[PDB]
């Protein structure tokens, strides 16, 4: 009785939200950006190849200096690379080799990682002893750790396969805020440039926008047909792009609270693993299961170029803060740095 | 053409690669086994005989084994099963005594049939096309006791065989191996274990060694 009545009210609210989004869908992003010229063909060459990982690379993250980057592989090794020289700065042996994510702190003093062990381990890079040591192990998730991102040296946000995201206090080792509401495994998260909001994509084919300080879900974005594997904020923080197993990328707007554009091709039938934007946000780079990375025109939904330099899945990619280069990691155990030439 | 500290940084990188090469050689000589099965199916008993993922290390006749238990994860299996692509073999545990039981959660699904659908997905999985399976049929002593009271007809309606233990045990093994839709790429090794058995480790070593040799014969091109 009461349960049946309440679940009918939820459907009425969903129809109200759907009507509200349709009301403000006066135009399409495609129509707005039809007049602007295309970016042309984007040609990028492999400037560097980072060798030394002996297993599938699952994650990488640039440091804020646009020169150092950390990559994670399931050979149980966290490696920090000097991208200019390809020198290995550190090699961090992981207690659990099943790592799925890695993060570089914006200060550059810490790195984080975690996987099937349900733990987010924090590593201190600047010690008087001259070696990298574990500074914190964040326990509390009951599923695998899928993504982690530092807010500062003391705060980090982690998403897990137990359908929840958490905000952690690194010094005390306790999760200050727990973000619940996803009905599937949360696979990725992206922090807003001001680090006051973050979006997460789960296996319920939905993306939720979370308030870090308040700790509740502000908006929910649907439209994908399969699990979302990747998510990335637009450089101004007013939009984000997702990548799913249905071979599509969608651009959602926070303020319009709805999908604006779909990035898919008929030849593409494989899942998407990673997404990122160029510094100006005009280019959307996505890694695919078909061993390639496709560069999309974010405004016009045109495939600008292809990064074909891997013999297995492109599992991760990232663009430097200065926008100079893009790194792609892959299951073939190699990392490559790409940029164009005049 | 490098500076004084640059030449020292390159030397540091070369030493890291030397240590990474050594760790890769050590890790490539270890046998990695993915342990699967259903809850309360004897899997815990197997580990003794030998909140995320539980790893067990043991050595048997100058061979190091890594056994990965992923039964404690309730997340989506398809989101992390590809991480084990490349293990030497999969150790699958099936409880024979659970043929007449009913799954506790579903309350209307046969427990034995729940293992078949789990086995069918793992055996036919795209990430384990070339990975052999070591099928352990646990609780054989309790299975014999249940045979006298509850016949096999409850589990298999289309079972015209005798109600003897040997005939009943062999029929269950055939059904599991018939779920293998690729009988050429992979092989299924079936062993009847028990709580008091002590030769389970030996069968794993024999099956793992058989997998390793047949992997070399594919590298050499003679097979």
């Amino acid at each position, epitope marked *: 009785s009461e349960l049946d009545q309440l679940r009918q009210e939820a459907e009425q609210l969903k129809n109200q939200i759907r009507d509200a989004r349709k009301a403000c869908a006066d135009a399409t992003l495609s129509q707005i950006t039809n007049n602007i010229d295309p970016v042309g063909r984007i040609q990028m060459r492999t400037r560097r190849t980072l060798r030394g990982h002996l297993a599938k690379i699952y994650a990488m993250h640039w440091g804020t200096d646009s020169r150092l980057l950390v990559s994670a592989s399931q050979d149980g090794k966290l490696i920090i690379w000097d991208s200019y020289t390809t020198n290995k700065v550190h090699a961090i042996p992981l207690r659990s080799s099943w790592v799925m994510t890695c993060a570089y702190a914006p200060s550059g003093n810490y790195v984080a990682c975690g996987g099937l062990d349900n733990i987010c381990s924090i590593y201190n890079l600047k010690t008087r*002893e*001259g070696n990298v040591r574990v500074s914190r192990e964040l326990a509390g998730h009951t599923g695998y750790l899928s993504c982690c991102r530092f807010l500062d040296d003391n705060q980090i946000v982690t998403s897990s396969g137990d359908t929840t995201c958490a905000l952690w206090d690194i010094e005390t080792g306790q999760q200050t805020t727990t973000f619940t509401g996803h009905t599937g495994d949360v696979m990725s998260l992206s922090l807003a440039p001001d680090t006051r909001l973050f979006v997460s994509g789960a296996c319920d084919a939905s993306a939720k926008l979370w308030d870090v300080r308040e700790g509740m879900c502000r908006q929910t974005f649907t439209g994908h047909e399969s699990d979302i594997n990747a998510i990335c904020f637009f450089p101004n923080g007013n939009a984000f792009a997702t990548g799913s197993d249905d071979a599509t990328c969608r651009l959602f707007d926070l303020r319009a609270d709805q999908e604006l554009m779909t990035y898919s091709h008929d030849n593409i039938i494989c899942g998407i693993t990673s997404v990122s934007f160029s510094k100006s946000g005009r280019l959307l780079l996505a890694g695919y299961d078909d061993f390639n990375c496709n560069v999309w025109d974010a405004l016009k939904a045109d495939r600008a170029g292809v990064l074909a330099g891997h013999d297995n899945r492109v599992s991760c990619l990232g663009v430097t803060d200065d926008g100079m280069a893009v790194a792609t990691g892959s299951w073939d155990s190699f990392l490559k740095i790409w940029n164009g030439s005049s | 053409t490098l500076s004084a500290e640059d030449k020292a*940084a390159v*030397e*540091r990188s070369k030493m890291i690669d030397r240590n990474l090469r050594e760790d890769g050689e050590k890790a490539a000589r270890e046998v990695k086994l993915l342990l699967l099965g259903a809850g309360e199916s004897g899997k815990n008993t197997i580990v003794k005989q030998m909140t995320g993922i539980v790893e067990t290390h043991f050595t048997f006749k100058d061979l190091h084994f890594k056994m990965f238990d992923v039964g404690a994860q309730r997340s989506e299996r398809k989101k992390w099963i590809h991480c084990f692509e490349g293990v030497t073999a999969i150790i699958f545990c099936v409880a024979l005594s659970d043929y007449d039981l009913v799954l506790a959660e579903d309350e209307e699904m046969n427990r034995m049939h729940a293992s078949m659908k789990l086995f069918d997905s793992i055996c036919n999985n795209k990430w384990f096309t070339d990975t052999s399976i070591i099928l352990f049929l646990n609780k054989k002593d309790l299975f014999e006791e249940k045979i006298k009271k509850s016949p096999l007809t409850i589990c298999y309606p289309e079972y015209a065989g005798s109600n003897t233990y040997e005939e009943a045990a062999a029929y269950i093994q055939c059904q599991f191996e018939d779920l293998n839709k690729r009988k050429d790429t992979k092989e299924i090794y079936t062993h009847f274990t028990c709580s008091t058995d002590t030769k389970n480790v030996q069968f794993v070593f024999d099956a793992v060694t058989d997998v390793i040799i047949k992997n070399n014969l594919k590298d050499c091109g003679l097979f």
Partner: single-chain antibody, 231 residues
Framework: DVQLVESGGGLVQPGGSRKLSCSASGFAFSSFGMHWVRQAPEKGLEWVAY????????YYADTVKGRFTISRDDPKNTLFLQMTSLRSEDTAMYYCVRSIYYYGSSPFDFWGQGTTLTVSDIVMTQATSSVPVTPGESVSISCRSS???????????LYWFLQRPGQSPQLLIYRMSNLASGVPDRFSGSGSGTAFTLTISRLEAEDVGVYYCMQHLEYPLTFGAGTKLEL
């Protein structure tokens, strides 16, 4: 805590042999390159030898090459300096210095207390030998080099050290601008090409001492004469 204790020094006859030891505790010794630096009584610092991490690269100063042998024992965390044919010119306090080299590292960050031995090339210039100072006043120290210390990679390999009376040298500024860990922010390093300045805002009593500028562009590493601050 990070410690470097030297032993084996003492009075030796000319032409003799002596073995200096440097025991390391509190840090990953095998990961650090090691230098020996000596300081003649009432004189400046002089680099002696260098052994890299992994013992693959070894360098010597010209004045000691062929007579001194530097070695390390990574499992024992001990650094050695085998000396032969000791001359009266070798009478100095020998310091054990750790230095690690990677992108963004701070070489020469920790110095040992030193051991005393008594026997019976880019030129770095610090023309100002002494500077009278008063507490709370800003002081600038100048250093010059015969060659440009700016490399094509953008680094300027100039280091600043402070040797307080009775204490071992301490790193202040590495690569001409970066401030070493544990050093107050009042110290600032500024330079260009061959001319460098160390600015000390709001001088305090602890800052009193001798300041040395060292170049790390190439071997042999050379030190400046040193500028003394006195009240």
């Amino acid at each position: 805590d990070v410690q470097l204790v030297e032993s084996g020094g003492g009075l030796v006859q000319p032409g003799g042999s002596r073995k200096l030891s440097c025991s390391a505790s509190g840090f990953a010794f095998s990961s650090f390159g090691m230098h020996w630096v000596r300081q003649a009584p009432e004189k400046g610092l002089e680099w002696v030898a260098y052994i890299s991490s992994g013992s693959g690269t070894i360098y010597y100063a010209d004045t000691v090459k062929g007579r001194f042998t530097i070695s390390r024992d990574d499992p024992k965390n001990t650094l050695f300096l085998q000396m032969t044919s000791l001359r009266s010119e070798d009478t100095a306090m020998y310091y054990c210095v750790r230095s690690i080299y990677y992108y963004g590292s701070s070489p020469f960050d920790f110095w040992g207390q030193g051991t005393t031995l008594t026997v019976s090339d880019i030129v770095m210039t610090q023309a100002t030998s002494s500077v009278p100072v008063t507490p709370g006043e800003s002081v600038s120290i100048s250093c010059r080099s015969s060659k440009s210390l700016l490399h094509s990679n953008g680094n300027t390999y100039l280091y600043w050290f402070l040797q307080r009376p009775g204490q071992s040298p301490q790193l202040l500024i590495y690569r001409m601008s970066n401030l070493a860990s544990g050093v107050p922010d009042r110290f600032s390093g500024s330079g260009s090409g061959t001319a460098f300045t160390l600015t000390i805002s709001r001088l305090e009593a602890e800052d009193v001492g001798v300041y040395y500028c060292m170049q790390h562009l190439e071997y042999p590493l050379t030190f400046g004469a040193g500028t003394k601050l006195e009240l």
